[PDB]
Tab-separated table of C-alpha atoms in Angstrom:
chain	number	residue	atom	x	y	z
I	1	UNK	CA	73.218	-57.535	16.734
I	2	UNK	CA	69.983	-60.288	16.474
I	3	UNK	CA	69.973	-60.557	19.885
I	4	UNK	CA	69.712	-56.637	20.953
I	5	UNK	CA	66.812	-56.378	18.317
I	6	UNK	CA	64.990	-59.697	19.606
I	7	UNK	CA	65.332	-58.713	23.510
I	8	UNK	CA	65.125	-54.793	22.563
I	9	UNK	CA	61.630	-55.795	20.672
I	10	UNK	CA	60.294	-57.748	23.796
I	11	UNK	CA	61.198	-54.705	26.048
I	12	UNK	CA	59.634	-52.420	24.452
I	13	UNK	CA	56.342	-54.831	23.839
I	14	UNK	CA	55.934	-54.937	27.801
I	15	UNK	CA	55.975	-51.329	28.020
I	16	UNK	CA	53.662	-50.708	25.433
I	17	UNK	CA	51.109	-52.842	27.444
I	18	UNK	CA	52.688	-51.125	30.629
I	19	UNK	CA	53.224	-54.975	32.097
I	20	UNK	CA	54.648	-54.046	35.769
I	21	UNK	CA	55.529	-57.451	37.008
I	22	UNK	CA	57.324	-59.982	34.407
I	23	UNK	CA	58.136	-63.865	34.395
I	24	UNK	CA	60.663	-65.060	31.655
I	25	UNK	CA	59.827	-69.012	31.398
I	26	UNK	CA	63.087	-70.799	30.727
I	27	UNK	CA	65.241	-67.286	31.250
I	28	UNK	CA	68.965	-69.191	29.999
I	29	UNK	CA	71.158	-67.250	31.278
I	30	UNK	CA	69.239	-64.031	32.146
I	31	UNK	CA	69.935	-61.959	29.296
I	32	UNK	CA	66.480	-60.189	29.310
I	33	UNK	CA	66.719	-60.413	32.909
I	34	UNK	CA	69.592	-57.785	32.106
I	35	UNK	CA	67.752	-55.311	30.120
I	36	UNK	CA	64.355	-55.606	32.542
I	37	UNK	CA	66.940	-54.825	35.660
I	38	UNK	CA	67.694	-51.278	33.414
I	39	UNK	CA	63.619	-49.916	33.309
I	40	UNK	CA	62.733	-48.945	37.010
I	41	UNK	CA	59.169	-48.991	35.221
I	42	UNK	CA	59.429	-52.668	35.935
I	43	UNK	CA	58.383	-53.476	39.410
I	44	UNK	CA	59.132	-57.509	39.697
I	45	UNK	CA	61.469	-59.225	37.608
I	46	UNK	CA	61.834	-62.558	37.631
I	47	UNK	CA	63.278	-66.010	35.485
I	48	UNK	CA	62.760	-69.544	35.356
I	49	UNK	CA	65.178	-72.538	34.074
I	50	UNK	CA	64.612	-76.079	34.403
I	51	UNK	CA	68.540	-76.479	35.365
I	52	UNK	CA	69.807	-75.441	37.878
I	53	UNK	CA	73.222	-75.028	36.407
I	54	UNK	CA	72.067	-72.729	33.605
I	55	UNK	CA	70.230	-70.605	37.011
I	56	UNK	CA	73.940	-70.528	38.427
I	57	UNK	CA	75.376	-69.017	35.919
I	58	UNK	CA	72.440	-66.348	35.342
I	59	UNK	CA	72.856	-65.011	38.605
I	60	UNK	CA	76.891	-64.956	37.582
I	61	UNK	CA	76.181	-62.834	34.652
I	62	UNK	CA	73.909	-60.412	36.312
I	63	UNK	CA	75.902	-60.144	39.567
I	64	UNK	CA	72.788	-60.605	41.770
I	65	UNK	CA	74.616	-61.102	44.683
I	66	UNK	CA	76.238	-57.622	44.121
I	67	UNK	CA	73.476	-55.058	42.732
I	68	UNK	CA	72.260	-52.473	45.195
I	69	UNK	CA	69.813	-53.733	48.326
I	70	UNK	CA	66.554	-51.804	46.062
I	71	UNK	CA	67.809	-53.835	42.769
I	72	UNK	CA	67.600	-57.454	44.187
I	73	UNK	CA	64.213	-56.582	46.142
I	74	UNK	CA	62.480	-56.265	42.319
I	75	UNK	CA	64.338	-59.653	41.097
I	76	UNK	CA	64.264	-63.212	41.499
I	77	UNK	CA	65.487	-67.016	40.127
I	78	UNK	CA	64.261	-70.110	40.753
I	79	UNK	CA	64.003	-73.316	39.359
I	80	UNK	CA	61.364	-75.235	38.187
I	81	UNK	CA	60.229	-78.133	35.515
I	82	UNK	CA	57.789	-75.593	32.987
I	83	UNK	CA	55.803	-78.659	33.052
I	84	UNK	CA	54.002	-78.979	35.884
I	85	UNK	CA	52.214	-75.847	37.902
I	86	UNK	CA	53.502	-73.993	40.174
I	87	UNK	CA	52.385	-71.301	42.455
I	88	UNK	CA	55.149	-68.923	41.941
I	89	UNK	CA	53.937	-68.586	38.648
I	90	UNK	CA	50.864	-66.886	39.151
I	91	UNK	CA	50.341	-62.644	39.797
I	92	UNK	CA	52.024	-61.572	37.003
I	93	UNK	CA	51.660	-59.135	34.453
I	94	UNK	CA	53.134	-60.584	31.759
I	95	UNK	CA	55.296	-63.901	30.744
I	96	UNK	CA	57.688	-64.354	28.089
I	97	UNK	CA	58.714	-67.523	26.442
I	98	UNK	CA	62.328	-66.289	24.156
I	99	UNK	CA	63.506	-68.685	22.384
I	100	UNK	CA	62.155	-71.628	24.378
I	101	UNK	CA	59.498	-73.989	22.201
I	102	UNK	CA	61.504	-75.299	19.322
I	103	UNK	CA	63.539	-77.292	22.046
I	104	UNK	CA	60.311	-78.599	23.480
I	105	UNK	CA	59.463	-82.310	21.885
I	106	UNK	CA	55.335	-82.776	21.449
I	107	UNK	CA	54.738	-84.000	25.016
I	108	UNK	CA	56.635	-80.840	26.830
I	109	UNK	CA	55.181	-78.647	24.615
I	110	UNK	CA	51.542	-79.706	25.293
I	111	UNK	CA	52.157	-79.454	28.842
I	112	UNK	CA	54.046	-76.244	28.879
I	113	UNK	CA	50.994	-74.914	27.419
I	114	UNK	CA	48.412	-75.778	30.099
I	115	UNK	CA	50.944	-74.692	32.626
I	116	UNK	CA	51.657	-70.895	30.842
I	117	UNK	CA	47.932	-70.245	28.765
I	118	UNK	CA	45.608	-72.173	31.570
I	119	UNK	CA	47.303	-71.881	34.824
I	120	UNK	CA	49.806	-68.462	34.775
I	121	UNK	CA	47.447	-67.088	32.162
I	122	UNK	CA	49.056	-63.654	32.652
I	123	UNK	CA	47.163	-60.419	30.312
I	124	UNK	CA	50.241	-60.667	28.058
I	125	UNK	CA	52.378	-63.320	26.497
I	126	UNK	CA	55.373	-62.749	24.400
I	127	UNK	CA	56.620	-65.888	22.542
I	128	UNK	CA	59.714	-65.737	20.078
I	129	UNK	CA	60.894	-68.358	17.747
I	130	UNK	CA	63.643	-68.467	15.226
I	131	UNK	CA	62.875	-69.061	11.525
I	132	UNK	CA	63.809	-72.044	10.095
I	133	UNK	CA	63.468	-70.559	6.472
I	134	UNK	CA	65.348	-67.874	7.317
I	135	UNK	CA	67.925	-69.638	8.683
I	136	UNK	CA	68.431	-72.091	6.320
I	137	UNK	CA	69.060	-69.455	3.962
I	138	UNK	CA	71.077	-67.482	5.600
I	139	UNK	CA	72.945	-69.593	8.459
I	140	UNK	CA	76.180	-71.181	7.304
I	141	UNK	CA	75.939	-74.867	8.768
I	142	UNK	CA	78.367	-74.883	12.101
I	143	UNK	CA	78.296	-71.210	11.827
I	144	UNK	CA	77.416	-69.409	15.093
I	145	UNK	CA	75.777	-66.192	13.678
I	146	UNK	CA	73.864	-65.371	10.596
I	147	UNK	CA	75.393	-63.541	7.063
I	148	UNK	CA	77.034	-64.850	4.294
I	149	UNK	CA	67.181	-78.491	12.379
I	150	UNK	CA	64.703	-78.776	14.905
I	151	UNK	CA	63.611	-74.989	14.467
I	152	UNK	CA	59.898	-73.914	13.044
I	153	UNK	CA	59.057	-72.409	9.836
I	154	UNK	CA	57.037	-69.274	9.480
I	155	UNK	CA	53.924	-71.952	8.898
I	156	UNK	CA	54.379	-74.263	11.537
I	157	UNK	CA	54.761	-70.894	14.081
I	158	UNK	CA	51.597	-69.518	12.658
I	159	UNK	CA	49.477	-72.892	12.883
I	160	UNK	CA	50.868	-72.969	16.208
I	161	UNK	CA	50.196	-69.415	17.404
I	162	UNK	CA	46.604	-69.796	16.287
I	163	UNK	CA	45.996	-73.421	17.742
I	164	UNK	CA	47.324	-72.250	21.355
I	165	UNK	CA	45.314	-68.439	20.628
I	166	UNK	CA	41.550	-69.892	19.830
I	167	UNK	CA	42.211	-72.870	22.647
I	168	UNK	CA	42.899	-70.589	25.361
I	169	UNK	CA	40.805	-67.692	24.347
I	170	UNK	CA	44.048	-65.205	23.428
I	171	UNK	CA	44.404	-62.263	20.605
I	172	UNK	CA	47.410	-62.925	18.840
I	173	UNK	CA	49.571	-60.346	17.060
I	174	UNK	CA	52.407	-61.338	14.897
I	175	UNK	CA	55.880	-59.525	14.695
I	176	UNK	CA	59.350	-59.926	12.158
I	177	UNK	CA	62.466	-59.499	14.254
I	178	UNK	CA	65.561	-59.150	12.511
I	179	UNK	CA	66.009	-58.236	8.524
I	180	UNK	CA	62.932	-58.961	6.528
I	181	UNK	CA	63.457	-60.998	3.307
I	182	UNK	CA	60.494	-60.455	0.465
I	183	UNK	CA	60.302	-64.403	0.228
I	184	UNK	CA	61.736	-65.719	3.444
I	185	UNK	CA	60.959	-63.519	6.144
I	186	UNK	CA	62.708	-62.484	9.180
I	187	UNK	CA	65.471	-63.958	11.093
I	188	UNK	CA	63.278	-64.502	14.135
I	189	UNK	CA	59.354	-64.782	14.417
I	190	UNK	CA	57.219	-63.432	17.326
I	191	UNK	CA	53.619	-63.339	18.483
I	192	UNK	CA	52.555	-61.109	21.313
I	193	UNK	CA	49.421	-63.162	22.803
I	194	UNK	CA	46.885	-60.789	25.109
I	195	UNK	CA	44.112	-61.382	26.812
């Protein structure tokens, strides 16, 4: 499925810059959490929310309270507003931002990027975005899952990826997730941000 690809993809980026300690800014429900916990290569792994309720039921899906003493020594939730800084942010290796900026208005967005490029201003960021285009074409409207509003086309992503890369001083690489189409592109966009 979409979702194996996009969280295989960001897995396998962190190893190829052999990132040790990872953040996941606005983790949901901890599904990457999940695949991190499964690479011993990854010494601290830990995930953010703004609410506290979607926190609760992370550490409900990844039975924290039940993995071995060694496994919850590498992990850890907390919760905080992504908009303001915070010094459990800082000392990692790498952050990653899944599926978290096209629900940001303007004024979050601005401030969620002083906050991640400025102040955590890790070696590697990994940002992922669907694709509007995409989408539109081939996401039946109240249809949960792809085949046959507020998201970002493959333009807007771009002009965003560079604005936040020359501000901040950041290489950015750009990745297709998902089936490429010729004329619409791939299902979800990515750009892997390093210092």
């Amino acid at each position: 499925n979409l979702n194996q690809q996009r969280l295989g993809t960001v897995v396998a980026v962190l190893k190829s810059v052999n990132a040790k300690k990872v953040i996941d800014l606005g983790c949901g429900e901890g599904n990457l959490l999940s695949l991190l916990l499964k690479d011993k290569s990854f010494e601290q792994i830990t995930g953010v929310d703004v609410s506290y309720s979607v926190l609760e039921r992370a550490k409900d899906r990844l039975k924290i309270d039940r993995l071995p003493e060694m496994q919850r020594k590498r992990i850890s939730l907390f919760q905080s507003s992504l908009v303001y800084r915070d010094k459990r942010f800082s000392g990692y290796d790498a952050a990653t931002v899944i599926e978290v900026i096209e629900h940001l208005d303007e004024n979050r967005l601005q401030a969620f990027e002083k906050v991640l490029f400025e102040f955590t201003r890790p070696q590697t960021v990994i940002v992922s975005t669907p694709n509007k285009e995409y989408n539109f074409h081939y996401q039946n409207l109240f249809e949960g899952n792809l085949r046959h509003r507020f998201e970002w086309t493959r333009k807007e992503f771009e002009t965003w990826a560079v604005k936040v890369a020359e501000k901040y001083g950041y290489s950015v690489r750009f990745l297709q997730i998902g089936e490429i189409d010729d004329e619409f592109g791939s299902p979800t966009q990515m750009g892997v941000f390093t210092l």
